[PDB]
Structure formats: structure tokens, C-alpha cells
Design a protein around this ligand. Structure first.
Ligand code: ATP
Ligand code: ATP
Ligand code: ATP
Ligand code: ATP
Ligand code: ATP
Ligand code: MG
Ligand code: MG
Ligand code: MG
Ligand code: MG
Ligand code: MG
Lengths: 267, 268, 258, 266, 270
């Protein structure tokens, strides 16, 4: 099964102190703080892809955290139901095998597991190891490349059967071509009929999305389709540079991207 | 089973030299001005079984106050009253070489009921059952997440049967929801009849506490209940932002919070 | 984990005075005759993970048997064997002040996966998605069951939890909840429905405090082809309260409107 | 605390038959019926008197006479000091749980915490984020019957008095909670105080220092439980005034069930 | 969404024999009904809400007829049939209407942008529509002229799936596709797009039987087997092509085989 997600006039603070103060001669104590999310409105139907974009600190992860209940609204309405699956910006590797890391407590299913490792391009990493997917890794994933950790992390999120998938920029340690292929095979094909929210800065991902949400300083800059945004603002393509770009990338990230490029052509 | 904690006009210096210095028509000197006390004129009283929340910004002397109760820091003036054994959970989550079970038990006599009640309240059942070796898998001084280490370190402090529990911000590496759940199940439920002092910046924790103590640069800013303080200072919610906020968190703290979030939606 | 439940030659009195008099009795006298035991010579065994259906006419002692297991009622004679935690769903659908989450969680620790599973099995997913507690009779019934089912226990005692539901919703929840989600748990279900007795590993029929039948449904069908609604303690719809009737109707409307 | 003495006490609820009893032979008092007749007992400081009898026997009326609502036409009543009264009716004031328990007298944190412990109100208070200071209205809406019963007893017990009059305060509780609170509150916390408890429970009679059985306003039995067992091995639910569960209101049965549910869920 | 239940169902296509079976049922004795042969005899199965039933069996076993009975064209002479809601039907015959591809898929029912897009993706029609100059608005005549067999099959499936129904009856919709495309569409359409819908799929593919929640094997009008694929394989380790109704490639028409070849060519030439 899958779920709708609806937000109506949502405002939220990470600080518990400022939240209560917002819910209240005159005075205005709320001003001493700043809302992380302000007047958020959207509705995504069952099985749709919502792409969320915006510059650093805009509140993209925070929006996901609010769906997950870590951040609570001080105003407005959130509607969604069922199980959540989360893929974080941080790729987390569990002590155990690659199979164990993907399955993560869920019952093993042959067809599902194979679909997922195929979609996330782990077949060559899963067979060309000493003892297949039974090789033991530790917490952190020292013996794995950044690209491997990202793909295992995505595989784990996609293997879980859920009503809502929250994907926080899962391709950032991958090279361009691998990102394009996995977006298509995983997010567009394997997850085709699951409601999903993807944090991304890729214009292509926005193009394929059913709905887009541009966040600016916690506020809704634009909600609708990419075509509508392009028609109103033919310049926006340039503002997409002011989101997540190279040279601002850390050292290990660039090295991971290079390693993923090397993997492609070494075959 | 549990102790009262009293402090009367307590002033203290970490530096022994400035402490010794501490204890107009005519000529006078004032050498004690050369040093600043870490704690100054501290007064509070916590009854048996009560919860005291201690808050304040970085460097205000919260850990130092706990250190004083432990006898690491010594008073130059005033009296400190507390009896029985002390248990201490630090900001630093310490992992002993050995197993998880031995890490929680750590010398203290083994009891089946108590141990299982502790690992439940600290949400360690799922961590213990997942490993092939159960709670008999070996650890160094790592292949553990920040959240796991924090949970084990709390479990250890809680397992010990003591008259006074000192909890120095034990939830920092946990996500919001896990923190809420463990505060309720461990601090509030399993430890309900125990005297405990909790260093925290969370409004909810201050609300639940019987008494609160707000420290400012080593001095008592407020002592009483949270309601009394909110009634006196409708501002205070804003002051609590200037305590321990996300903007200062290190990378490994931020990432520990994130994988605790992952754990909830990926495991069990 | 889960537990076995054993009852050997059990007799019990709700009135302590008559209970203690049976113990004192344990030319001649028989002062114990002045009272009447609520349960008399009860014998059954339910294996770990099995379902016991308890049926019988109004006042036969179905709830009291559950109260005895919970220790509210004490035996004057015999042995009762059960270990671990008990979870109880009453005929009364209790709603606490607080949220729906707080009502379901009710003093045990929150677990995300388990929570979502229980919401699914009790058909509360749409209800929950739509705040202090407003509710339909059906919603109250489902939340109250969800609470009992959410608690991790060795033994589940379910006292007629489906009464305020329409036939179709009761069937679906008995399947998803009692049969599937709770498949490996020891459960005792007070019910009057043929389908439930068919599915149970064992059935106990009570009559005026005594054991009328113990065994399987198929064994009962041979010995009693003459169905009795009175003896089984079946629903008398014309005697249902206006509240109960309208709850059943509302649940029927819900199926076809939402 | 106080002693309670009653010597040859007879009383009428109606003022008319009062002085008529206090008076050719004529007896106009006969067309009235005395609610209590020739009552005799003596309970020492710190002792528990258990009072039992069928419905309408005069158990509550006896408490009412001690409180002064009912005046004797004959005999002597001796008791001194303040009285605390816990009624069959569980009453809730406008205001918070704390204020409901405190009820006017000066706050004492130690005494208060002891009372809420003994009356099992700790989970009730700690559940709310507003704790002790969340408001309730008159009637006790949004509270369960079990909670009202516990708050009402808490109020009665918190009050410092020489004599405590407890009129069947457990009726809306399940068997187990009644047993636990009888023990922790009436038997332990109030062990130093003189108390009179109207009850039907055999267990309460055993723990009492003295028991008084009423029947139609007259003293059927006065003495210990052991003496009563000797004299009367034939237990009678009717005579002891045992609760007929089938005669319970929907709200009372549902209260008991909610208390049962509270125990196994929390 | 709906449940489908059949219990001891018998049916005749010929009305005369159906009425004869019922008239002799209520009533020295006679048995006139033996003169006819029922298309379906003693049918028993159950599929729950949102589940996939796979129906297999040899040619003439009565697979389409069972679908025809659910649709009310064939009437039961005996037994219980339970189902509710709207039915959508995809036939072995790929029907093309006069009109555009859009009109063909929509089929009068209201247009919904997202639903339409979801269906054309799941049925692999995105390439086809875009490849045409006027896109969705290219005019098709009745029957077959302009489109390939694979295209006709995908449009016909898309129409069935676009309709909002509580029961989807899919009578061997992939026969004119190559193996790889059939695999992909069974996954993307039948399993994912229709994941929460009650569906009955007539098929001869082991893969489909494996994925189904329940299978129903038909043999000369009667229930040969009902259960899961695991239960079947445990109770029958010997595979029979004839019994399962496995479509023999030799017994395919020239147009069918060439449609399969065209689909393979499409994959490698675009
Ligand atoms: N766990 C948290 N607790 C408190 N504040 C947080 C937390 N996570 C993020 N924030 C705050 O929320 C605000 C928005 O940050 P957020 O991480 O949601 O931005 P983002 O759009 O995901 O940025 P980026 O593109 O770099 O990932 C920031 O001020 C940040 O400090
Ligand atoms: N072990 C120590 N020896 C000497 N000085 C110390 C020691 N620990 C803390 N201090 C000093 O005491 C002062 C107060 O520090 P303390 O750690 O008690 O503040 P805090 O309230 O716990 O701050 P934080 O919230 O960052 O933990 C600081 O000047 C600090 O350098
Ligand atoms: N809490 C109680 N205290 C005293 N007597 C009780 C109590 N509960 C039930 N009884 C009595 O026990 C006897 C059996 O009642 P019980 O409620 O167990 O029957 P039941 O089978 O559950 O009937 P129903 O179908 O109406 O639920 C009755 O006489 C009833 O009055
Ligand atoms: N306030 C009153 N004013 C006048 N008569 C009263 C009053 N209260 C009780 N009575 C009468 O006193 C008689 C005895 O009743 P009482 O309430 O003392 O019996 P009880 O033993 O408490 O019965 P129960 O077990 O039902 O509580 C009854 O006739 C009753 O009507
Ligand atoms: N519309 C109809 N009217 C009358 N008889 C029919 C009709 N359709 C099919 N039949 C007959 O019903 C019987 C069963 O044929 P049916 O088409 O249902 O088998 P099938 O399993 O679908 O075979 P196939 O694999 O070739 O499609 C045959 O005798 C057939 O002639
Ligand atoms: Mg982010
Ligand atoms: Mg510190
Ligand atoms: Mg009952
Ligand atoms: Mg009375
Ligand atoms: Mg056919």
C-alpha cells in the first residue's frame, strides 16, 4: 500500500521554547527565534514523486524530519499514513554482511532482493567479493567506497516495503552517470507506484517529478510542476546553481565521485 | 534506598591556589579577586526520590556541580549534604573493553530481573538480540554508533543501585524521539523512586522535574519549579535556546542523531 | 514470548464470604450451600500460541473466567497455571484523555514498526490520519482492541471486542488481527460467532458456571447438531441499545461512503 | 486523635418524633420509626471500627449522627475534635487535582506526596504535562470513576483530623485496587488515627479492631471478627450488606472494568 | 477493491441444458441433464481484496468462460458466487477503436492527467506516443492497419488498467509480446501499478504463477488445483505443458510470431 501526503499552512520550530511562544497593549516573544519551516502547503497523491529543492539551510531535511515526527508543527495540518522508509544524507553501514545491511531485519525474499540490488547497481559488488554478499563489514564501512555505501544505503531504504519513502539527496557521492541510471531504475521504475519525496538539486529529477517544492529560508518559494516554474521563471535554471554544487564539495565526496567514475570504465 | 541532597551557601574553585586565598579606614588586602570561583553561593535542596533539572549555557558550571557532589571539586565555604552511593552518567559515553553485558554490569553483582528491566528502559533489547553472540559480543575501547554507546553508558549508570544518580546530558547523541522515549521510560519510570540530578536544556525535562536549577557563570540564576520561572519570566523559552543548540553540534554528533533516526525507520 | 494456560478442577466465588466458607467446609454441616460458585469444576489446557474460544449464555461466567486469570477472582479449589504478562481487552471500549497514540500506547514503550502493524491490523490507518479525545462506536472499539493488541504479552484476553462493529468489519479484523498479527500468541477470545469457534484450536462452552463442552468445533458439531442461540449466548439484536445499533449502522455506512 | 463512645443511643431523623420519644399512658412516638436504636460501642484512639449491615440498616446515618446532622433522643455520644468525611458519593471541586485534594488547608509537600502514593495517584498526576496543576470542573468530567474515588479518598485522608469517617469509598474500584488501597491507606498511612469504615468486605472485618453489625437501626453484633465467626459460621450476603453486582449501575460496572484495564495497561 | 468467492459452481453456455440441470436437480428416477456437458463444473476458489489470482489450464479448459461468468455473460446453474464493484476486462483480442490513442485508452471515462501518465508509463507506451508527430492525438481506424501487434496489445491493456474498477480481469494480455517486454510489463503494470487491486490473470507462465497470491488450475471445466505455487510444486514435481496450457510456439499464427519478432527488434533498434 501507499499514502497521500498533505501539508496545510504548516509552521514549525526546532526549538521547543519558540514553538509554544508562537502559539500566543501587546507582546510578541516569538521574534527571538526563527521558524525552520513557514507556511508550507502541498498535496501529493498516492504513488507520486515530490522533488524538494533549495539552497543549504533552506529546510529540506527538516521537512522530512517533520514527516517523521522529530520536528513538530506549531501551526497547520499534516496528513499521511502508514510506514515510512528513510534514506539519509549520511550513509550508515551496520556491522554485518551486505545482505544483512540491505535486509535489515525484514524477511528475506529472493525476487525482491534481486530487484533491489539490480536497481541500485550492486550486482557486480555483490558477486565479485570473496564470499558473495556474506562478507562481513563493520560500523562505518571503512573497507567500502563512498559510492558503495551510498548504494547499499539506498538499497536498504528501497528493500523495505513502506507507504512513504523519504530520500534525502542519496546520489551525492555518485558520479553523474550512475546518479542518472539509478534515479531511472530505482526512483522512477522500481518505486514507480510508491509515494516518495526526493531532496535533489538535479533539474532532470525536477523535470520527472509529479510536483516540485522550492524552499527558500524555510518558506515556500514555489509549488507546482517544473514546466509551470520554467514558464514563470525561465531564469530558475540558473538559481539551481545556488543549491548544491562542486568545489563546495568536501574531499572524500570528490574522491567518491571519481572512484564511481573509475568503477564504470573498469567494468 | 535514596538520599536527600542539600547545598548551603556553597562556593568553590577548581584551582586549589585560588581556593586557599578565599578562606574604609584600616588597611586591607583582597587577593581572592585574582581568581574566579567555578560555583558561587549555590543553594538547593532535593528530597528523596525527587528529580532536579540543572540548566544553563556552556561553561555555567553544570558538570562542575556534579563533580563537587562526587568530591572531585571541593568547597571553600558552605555545606554539602548527601549520603549513600553515587551513580554517574557522563557527557562522555565510555565503552569498556569487553562485552555489552559486562559493560552494563561492570563489577556490580548480576541480577536477571534488574538487567532485563534496564536494557528494556534504555531500548537495548533490539541491539542485544540483533548480534549473533547476543549481549556476549566483545567491544574495544569502534563498530558501535554514537546512539548505541550513549544507550549502553546510560544503562550502566542506571543498573547500579545507588542513592543518588547524576546524569550529565546523556541524550545528546540521540534523536528527539528516542530522547523523549528514554527520558520517560528510564529517568521518569524505572528511576521514579530514586534521587536524580539531570543536566539538560530540554523544556520538557525541566517541566517534568520537581525542581529546577538555572546556572549562570557559576551562580544561581533560578531555583524552584518551571511554572514559577515561566510565570516570572515568560521570556525563558528564548533563554533556553542559548544553552545547547544544534548550530554548535560537531559532525559526529549530527551524524549520530541521523543514524538514530534511520534506526527507528529501518530496524525492528 | 508466550505462555501455556492450565486450569485444574477450579471452583470460584465472587463473594469472599462464600469463598472462605467453602474453604472451612473443605452428623455433618454444609454452610457453603448458602452461596453459589460463579465457576465450578473448570478444566482446560491451552498450549502456547493457541486460541481458546469461550462461549455460553449471558451470565455463564465468561468474563469471570477472565477475571480469575487476571486475579480479580480467586479460586477456592483447584490449580491455575499461567506465566508472564497479561493483556486484556474488555467489552467496555475504554478511551483515555489524550491522543489516539497515547490511548493505544497506554503506558508501554513506543515501537514504530509494531505501532504501524497494529494500526493496519485494526483498520485504524484512515481514522488515525484524520488532538485530545468525537469518536464513533466503531472507532472506540478498534482503538480499545489496538491497545490490547499493542501490548507485548504472554497472554491475551479478549472479551467480546467486536460487538459495536458490523459483520464485515468484525470478520476482517478477526482475520487480520486475532488470526494473523497474533498468530503466535496465546489468546482467549470470548465470542458467540460460528466462524471464530471454527478457527479456534480449542473451544470452551460455559453453562451456569460449569463446563458444558471442551474440545474442537468439529467434535461439538457431532454432539450437537441442534444449534441453540440461547446456549451459545448469541447476539439478540432487538435487545441491543440504540447506541450499539447505530454504531453497527455507522460502520456499515463507513464501508460504503469512505 | 479521639475516642468514640456511644451509650444507649436512640435517634430519629425527623424532628417531630424526637421530643415525642423524650416524653393514661400515651406513646405518640410509635407512628415514627427510629433510624438508630440502643447503639452501644467504644472505639479507642487509633483503632479501626468496621461497620456492616444490609442496605438501609443505618450505616451512613450512624456517621451522620457523629457529624451532628442527626441528633440523639436518648443516650450519650462522646467524641472530640475535627472530623474528616469520605462519602459514598465521590465529589470533585472546580479546579485542579492538587487543589481538590488540598481543599483549603495549608499545603505540605511531604504529607501530600505520602497521600498520593497511598491512594495510587502518582501515575494519574505524572501523566499530564501540567502535572498537579491541570484544571477539572465540578462533577469530575474527563475523569474515570476510579480516579474520582481515589481523589475523593485522598482529600479525606490529607485533612488532619481526630476522627475519620469512611463511607464505602472503594465501590467503584476493582477488587485488587480496593485491597491494595485498604492496606496502604486505611491500614498503614492512617494506622495512628481513629477511623470508622462502612464496608461489606470480610477482609476489612478481619483487620478491624472492632466490628459493628447493624440491622434495621439496631446493634446485631458488636465485637471482634473472631467472636463473630464463632457465633455465626453461616455467612449471609443480605445481612452483611454485600454488594449485589447485578444491581450496579452501568457507570459503576464500567468504572470497575476501567480500573481492571488500568492495571493491565497503565 | 473486492473479494471474489466461488463455491461449488457449475455452468452451461447453452441455456437449454442449464435449465434442464436445474429442473432435474429439484426432482423410478430420470436424469435428462446428462445430455449436456457443463463448461464449468464444481468450481471452488477465493481471492481476497487486492490479491492476484493466476488462472492456468489447457486450451478449452474454461479459463475465459470463468471470466465470462464473473461478467454475467455465463450464468451459474448451481453454487455461490460472491463479488462486488466494477469490473474491467482485458481480452485475448486486442480491440482498437476509431479515434486517437488517448481516446482509445480513456474510452469516454473522464481524463485524469496523472492517472493517464501513470498508465502509459506502466504499459510502456511513452516511446510510442512521443514517436508520433501529433503524440497522443494520432488517429487510428477500427481494427488493424497502422499499429503493430505489440502496440495494440499495450494500448488494449492500458485501456483496461486506466478504468477505475474493483476487479480487473486480464485474459492473456501478453501473447503478442516478446519475453522481455512481457516480463517488464507484468512487473510494472500487473504487480506495481495494480498492486492494491483485485486481479485475475489468465496466464501460462511459471513466473506469473510464482508471483500470484493464489493460483487456480482448470482442467476440462473443473478445479484441478487451488492454492499457492509452493503448494503446487510440492504436490506436483512433474511439469505438464498440456495441463498448464503452455502456449506451444509452433501453434502460433504468422502475425503473432512476427509481432513477437517486431517487439524484439523494437528493443534493439528503438
Ligand atoms: N536535528 C536538528 N535539530 C535542530 N535544528 C536542526 C536540526 N536539523 C537541522 N536543523 C536546523 O534547521 C535549519 C535548516 O537546516 P536543514 O538541515 O533542514 O537544511 P537543508 O535544506 O537540508 O540543507 P542542506 O542542503 O545542506 O542539506 C538549520 O538552521 C539547521 O541548523
Ligand atoms: N576537571 C576540571 N578541572 C578544572 N576545571 C574544570 C574542570 N571541568 C570543568 N572545568 C572548568 O569549569 C568551568 C565550568 O565548566 P563546566 O564544564 O562545569 O560547564 P558546563 O555547564 O558543564 O558546560 P557544558 O554545557 O559545555 O558542558 C569552565 O571554566 C571549565 O573550564
Ligand atoms: N466484578 C464482579 N463482582 C461480583 N460479581 C460479578 C462480577 N462480575 C460478574 N459477576 C457475576 O458473575 C456472574 C457471571 O457473570 P459474567 O459477567 O462473568 O457472565 P458473562 O458470561 O460474561 O455474561 P455476558 O454474556 O453478559 O458478558 C453473574 O452472576 C454476575 O453478576
Ligand atoms: N439525610 C437524611 N435525612 C433523612 N433520612 C435519611 C437521610 N439519610 C438516610 N436517611 C434514612 O435513614 C434510613 C437508613 O438509611 P442509611 O442511609 O443510613 O442506610 P445505609 O446503611 O447507609 O444503607 P446503604 O447500604 O444503602 O448505604 C433510611 O430510611 C433513609 O431514608
Ligand atoms: N461465448 C461463448 N458462447 C458459447 N460457448 C463458448 C463461448 N466461449 C467459449 N465457449 C466454449 O466454452 C468452452 C471452454 O472454452 P474457453 O474459451 O473458456 O477455454 P479457454 O481455457 O479460455 O481456452 P483458450 O486457452 O484457448 O483460451 C469451449 O467448449 C468453448 O467452445
Ligand atoms: Mg539537508
Ligand atoms: Mg558539562
Ligand atoms: Mg461478559
Ligand atoms: Mg449508606
Ligand atoms: Mg481463452
Amino acid at each position: 500500500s501507499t499514502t497521500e501526503v498533505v501539508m496545510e499552512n504548516v509552521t514549525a520550530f526546532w526549538e521547543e521554547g519558540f514553538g509554544e511562544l508562537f502559539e500566543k497593549s501587546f507582546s510578541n516573544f516569538s521574534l527571538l527565534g526563527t521558524p525552520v519551516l513557514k507556511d508550507i502547503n502541498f498535496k501529493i497523491e498516492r504513488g507520486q514523486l515530490l522533488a524538494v529543492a533549495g539552497s543549504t539551510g533552506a529546510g529540506k531535511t527538516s521537512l522530512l524530519m517533520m514527516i517523521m515526527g522529530e520536528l513538530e508543527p506549531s501551526e497547520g495540518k499534516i496528513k499521511h499514513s502508514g510506514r515510512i522508509s528513510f534514506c539519509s544524507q549520511f550513509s550508515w553501514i551496520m556491522p554485518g554482511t551486505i545482505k544483512e545491511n540491505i535486509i535489515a531485519g525484514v524477511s528475506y525474499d529472493e525476487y525482491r532482493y534481486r530487484s533491489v540490488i539490480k536497481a541500485c547497481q550492486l550486482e557486480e559488488d555483490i558477486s565479485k567479493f570473496a564470499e558473495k554478499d556474506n562478507i562481513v563489514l563493520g560500523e562505518g564501512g571503512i573497507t567500502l567506497s563512498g559510492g558503495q555505501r551510498a548504494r547499499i544505503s539506498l538499497a536498504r531504504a528501497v528493500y523495505k516495503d513502506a507507504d512513504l519513502y523519504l530520500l534525502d539527496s542519496p546520489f551525492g557521492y555518485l558520479d553523474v552517470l550512475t546518479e542518472k541510471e539509478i534515479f531511472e531504475s530505482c526512483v522512477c521504475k522500481l518505486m514507480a507506484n510508491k509515494t516518495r519525496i526526493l531532496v535533489t538539486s538535479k533539474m532532470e529529477h525536477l523535470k520527472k517529478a509529479d510536483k516540485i517544492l522550492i524552499l527558500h529560508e524555510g518558506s515556500s518559494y514555489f509549488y507546482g510542476t517544473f514546466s509551470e516554474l520554467q514558464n514563470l521563471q525561465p531564469d530558475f535554471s540558473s538559481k539551481l546553481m545556488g543549491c548544491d554544487s562542486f568545489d563546495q564539495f568536501s574531499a572524500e565526496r570528490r574522491n567518491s565521485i571519481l572512484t564511481e567514475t573509475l568503477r564504470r570504465f573498469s567494468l
